[PDB]
Amino acid sequence: VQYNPEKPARPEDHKPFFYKYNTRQLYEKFSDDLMQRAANDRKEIEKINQLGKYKPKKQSLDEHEVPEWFRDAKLGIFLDWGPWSVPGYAPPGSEGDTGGSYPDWYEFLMDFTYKAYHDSIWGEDFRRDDFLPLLHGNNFDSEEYAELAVQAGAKYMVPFARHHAGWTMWESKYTFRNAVEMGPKRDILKELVEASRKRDLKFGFYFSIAEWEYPVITKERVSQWDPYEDMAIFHDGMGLIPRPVPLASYFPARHDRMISGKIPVKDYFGDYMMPLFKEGVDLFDPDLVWYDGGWGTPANSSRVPELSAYFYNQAEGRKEVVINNRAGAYLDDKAEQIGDYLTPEYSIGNVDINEPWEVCRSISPAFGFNWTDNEENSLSSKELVKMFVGIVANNGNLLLVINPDGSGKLSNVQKDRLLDLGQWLKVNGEGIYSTRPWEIQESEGNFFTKSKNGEFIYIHILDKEKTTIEVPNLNPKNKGAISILGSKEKVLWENSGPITRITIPESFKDERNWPNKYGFTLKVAVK
Amino acid sequence: VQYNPEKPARPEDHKPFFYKYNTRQLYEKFSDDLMQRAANDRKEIEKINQLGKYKPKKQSLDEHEVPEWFRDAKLGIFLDWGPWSVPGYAPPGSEGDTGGSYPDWYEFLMDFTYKAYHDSIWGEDFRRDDFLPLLHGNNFDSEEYAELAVQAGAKYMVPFARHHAGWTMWESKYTFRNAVEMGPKRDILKELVEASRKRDLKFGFYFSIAEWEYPVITKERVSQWDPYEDMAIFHDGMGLIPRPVPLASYFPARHDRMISGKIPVKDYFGDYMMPLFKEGVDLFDPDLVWYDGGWGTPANSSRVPELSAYFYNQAEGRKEVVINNRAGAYLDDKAEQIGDYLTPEYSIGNVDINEPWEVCRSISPAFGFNWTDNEENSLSSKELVKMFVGIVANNGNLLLVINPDGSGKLSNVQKDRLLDLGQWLKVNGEGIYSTRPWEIQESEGNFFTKSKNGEFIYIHILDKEKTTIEVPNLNPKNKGAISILGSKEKVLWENSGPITRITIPESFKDERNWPNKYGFTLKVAVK
Ligand code: NA
Ligand code: NA
Structure with a gap:
């Protein structure tokens, strides 16, 4: 009858288990x-x-x-x-x-x-x-x-x-x-x-x-x-x-x-x-x-x-x-x-x-x-x-x-x-559910997905020691094309030939200002 | 330590046996x-x-x-x-x-x-x-x-x-x-x-x-x-x-x-x-x-x-x-x-x-x-x-x-x-040790062996319900060629064409007069 399931051992009055039919x-x-x-x-x-x-x-x-x-x-x-x-x-x-x-x-x-x-x-x-x-x-x-x-x-x-x-x-x-x-x-x-x-x-x-x-x-x-x-x-x-x-x-x-x-x-x-x-x-x-x-x-x-x-x-x-x-x-x-x-x-x-x-x-x-x-x-x-x-x-x-x-x-x-x-x-979750791999998957500890229709690239940032993100061939739609899921904080960025260079907002240097403390995600409208 | 060897079961204070080396x-x-x-x-x-x-x-x-x-x-x-x-x-x-x-x-x-x-x-x-x-x-x-x-x-x-x-x-x-x-x-x-x-x-x-x-x-x-x-x-x-x-x-x-x-x-x-x-x-x-x-x-x-x-x-x-x-x-x-x-x-x-x-x-x-x-x-x-x-x-x-x-x-x-x-x-034992099979082995509940040299035939009689023993092609040496192991009692017999017919002595009708109660043995000197 009795055992502690979190430290399980033989019960004190163990009887053999015989199903009604052998x-x-x-x-x-x-x-x-x-x-x-x-x-x-x-x-x-x-x-x-x-x-x-x-x-x-x-x-x-x-x-x-x-x-x-x-x-x-x-x-x-x-x-x-x-x-x-x-x-x-x-x-x-x-x-x-x-x-x-x-x-x-x-x-x-x-x-x-x-x-x-x-x-x-x-x-x-x-x-x-x-x-x-x-x-x-x-x-x-x-x-x-x-x-x-x-x-x-x-x-x-x-x-x-x-x-x-x-x-x-x-x-x-x-x-x-x-x-x-x-x-x-x-x-x-x-x-x-x-x-x-x-x-x-x-x-x-x-x-x-x-x-x-x-x-x-x-x-x-x-x-x-x-x-x-x-x-x-x-x-x-x-x-x-x-x-x-x-x-x-x-x-x-x-x-x-x-x-x-x-x-x-x-x-x-x-x-x-x-x-x-x-x-x-x-x-x-x-x-x-x-x-x-x-x-x-x-x-x-x-x-x-x-x-x-x-x-x-x-x-x-x-x-x-x-x-x-x-x-x-x-x-x-x-x-x-x-x-x-x-x-x-x-x-x-x-x-x-x-x-x-x-x-x-x-x-x-x-x-x-x-x-x-x-x-x-x-x-x-x-x-x-x-x-x-x-x-x-x-x-x-x-x-x-x-x-x-x-x-x-x-x-x-x-x-x-x-x-x-x-x-x-x-x-x-928008950067996860119904996504597919992008031409880059992992780079510098950052992870990438794209929406299955190809309109959006997502960039998952997990490390609070980050200030700049450099992404080759990201190609944002316009200067307002990058945002952060679950946040109103504006993301400033500049192109430099093929490379897009994203500066993390000041508030996001400390991970207690993240919508979720285990990571934030950039949403990038591309095209 | 303790068990009854004539009704053996688990001892009362059984300890596992570990040889000094596993x-x-x-x-x-x-x-x-x-x-x-x-x-x-x-x-x-x-x-x-x-x-x-x-x-x-x-x-x-x-x-x-x-x-x-x-x-x-x-x-x-x-x-x-x-x-x-x-x-x-x-x-x-x-x-x-x-x-x-x-x-x-x-x-x-x-x-x-x-x-x-x-x-x-x-x-x-x-x-x-x-x-x-x-x-x-x-x-x-x-x-x-x-x-x-x-x-x-x-x-x-x-x-x-x-x-x-x-x-x-x-x-x-x-x-x-x-x-x-x-x-x-x-x-x-x-x-x-x-x-x-x-x-x-x-x-x-x-x-x-x-x-x-x-x-x-x-x-x-x-x-x-x-x-x-x-x-x-x-x-x-x-x-x-x-x-x-x-x-x-x-x-x-x-x-x-x-x-x-x-x-x-x-x-x-x-x-x-x-x-x-x-x-x-x-x-x-x-x-x-x-x-x-x-x-x-x-x-x-x-x-x-x-x-x-x-x-x-x-x-x-x-x-x-x-x-x-x-x-x-x-x-x-x-x-x-x-x-x-x-x-x-x-x-x-x-x-x-x-x-x-x-x-x-x-x-x-x-x-x-x-x-x-x-x-x-x-x-x-x-x-x-x-x-x-x-x-x-x-x-x-x-x-x-x-x-x-x-x-x-x-x-x-x-x-x-x-x-x-x-x-x-x-x-x-003389009818057992150093013997070999004879041309007959078992007949009418009687068992036969021969000495390895072929001089003697032995006939083991195990049943007290016996009075005559009829043995085909047992050719005894002479009229005194048959005896009983462990006994001085005389054994009378007659040939009848191919068959030798042995009459069990009167005393041997009861098995308490046998040298051994589980059987007696005829010794036959043959050709
Ligand atoms: Na398939
Ligand atoms: Na051999």
Whole structure:
């Protein structure tokens, strides 16, 4: 029952969590029915793709274009919440190759990289699924999360609808491992989509392709030591740590309490994943699909191309939609990809400025709550603004991860950063939303954007140690063509051959006279 | 400290077992030295095989013949004792394809098939290596074990020198996972070899080829989640349950306390197994090598042919020696085998009567102590005698497994069966030792053997409901050519064309007048 979510550890009278049905019980009651229902959905998907514009082929899917709303959005919120939020930890030195830290991998890595921590803090008898009842979500207010996104200046919201251990934020007909059956006992994704739609936030559907473990029905026994000859555990390469592939032996006392709620199938992809995706799309009508966890199986074999075509086709002539690039390797036997935009993770890297892209990260290294995170290891508001503008100037969006604890509460450090960014965007948003890169992006610590129609150039000034700005080939319309967003203060400037030389007004030498203390923005009418 | 070995469960104040060195410490201190020492041993082995009669080739090894002493022995004792003896359990329904039950697989299957039992009875925090201090061996008297083998009528003794988790009954220079460092704190194999030699028992060296897990040194990291980039866990297919092959990621909090004492190497076979085998052979000068655990790697790749040639070669001119057939599949890339005799396990199956073979089993299904075993699920003395004679008549030896508890004490049920068999053999042993199959083996519940020279036929009579024995083509020498071992009672008989008809003396109708109550034996001087 009781833990402090801000310093989470084993409760004093921990009892094991047994879902009303174990995995064999779920097999005996639900598997056949689920597999029949899945067969029907697959036929529906095939027909929609038959009738529709888009076919499950790269050639066909690549012709879909990034919508204007996505290019114009610039800022999204990535709502990284789930059972992993309860322990809310990754240890020092366990960073991924991205450079990020992954508390949101705790459910898997508790038996591996994070096991020393788990053994001492939670106990060796505390299983993955024991976290599910502890994810009560009593401070999780879906209305306030949508409002916070708005107040942060975000134009889209992507909750972690279903991550790699298979727990769905929505009430599903294809799994009892869902938010109504387990944890907060409410349809969290439904609350969030309703809260988002009534605020004009675009809504993204985050969907893990593979899962770390899934119980499957087999035609032969895996080994002679197995209690069941008709059942196994399915893996692909998603977990990165080598496991038996495709099948591991199934042992109830080992597996049941890391797969609570999951109904066995013969075919993980066809019988479970495909219809679960369809259900999410059909129920929630997302504007965006954010695939993840598809590096373990080629997109050809996982059948994600059919899901991508479906998503496009059920939207055609209703709304413009977009998909990320994480469907997996697209082969025709590195590989190629499908999807509308690249998703560099934590570290921006070398980006192609010609095509819109999206970086995902939180204000710290953490993907998922880390209870040890605080002001000193997180971005300052100043650093966040600076980082955001740099992203936008280079044709990117920021999908800003936020990391609530097991109660669903967001730390003040994270709240304050979001509200400071949003308050900066309230003033300077005209130089951000619906902008495109200019022929210069960054110069002398100043950042440039242009309005998509080309009438205005914006210059974001973040450093109070500045007096003159020299901009080659700016070409202001007339001597009154330069102003400051959110201010009446007149900007004096002169041309000097090709270079425009701007003197910062006297009052703006001190950043307490700025409309917003984290930066001011010059608006330049050009032509 | 305290458990009841006859009903073993988690001690009351269990503390974790940490060997003075963990796996990284063993790597830093000992690995280099071990790998240099291994290099020297490998050169020694290569030279011995270079200069010697036998080469590491099937053609060469197959020319070695089963020694007369093995064919003449008939009965051996298989001393199945180790860390697994402490928990002393396998659950119902977990039988191998052999039909046997394997408490001696507990160390592995505690995380798999036997995990339900282990979780409730020992606890999820109780690791494999926690059993090692509990194997105190305070009732393990090596002198009495050798004497018991003699009193059972056994001619050879095969202790479980090293089983699949790698714990050596001898003090080794190639592992700290040995009987002196861990468990009874004495050189158990040394005690047993000395006790055996002074009783003229032949001595067998039981040696597992593969182990379930071994820490190995790598040239690159297995996954990005690994704490060490220079280390992994090596597996082959020996465990049967699929594992990552050849390498799994290594995690100290997961692995260290199932591999206590084991010094990491680059090459499991070359750097560890080969020199450990050599050490055992050189130190103990065994008459017999009993390989096991070689079905996970072909004999070609494990390099066991070189060990077989070595063993033969270091014995040439000193003693006649023998090897079983469990080196592994012999290929030249359904496969062939090397070794001197077949080893059907638990169930005899279809045997080739033309070549000597050996069946291994205990008086119950169990390989390894099962604390729930008792009189009612074990062979009676009568059934054991009957089973033994059937084996011998078909050209087999019985390698009779005995199963002590964690204190090293053997159950009375097991002791009584052995003493009854030995007492039957004391009387009737002339019809067993140094015998060969006759043209009839079993007929009408009677069993036949012949002396190896062909002078005598022996007929073992086990059922008191018998008055006449009719034997085709038994040609007795003269009218006084038939007697009863251990008795002066005259045996009357008549020929009737091809058939010899023997009347059982009046007194022998009741089995209380038999020299031994479990059977009497006719001795027939023939042509
Ligand atoms: Na495209
Ligand atoms: Na041979």
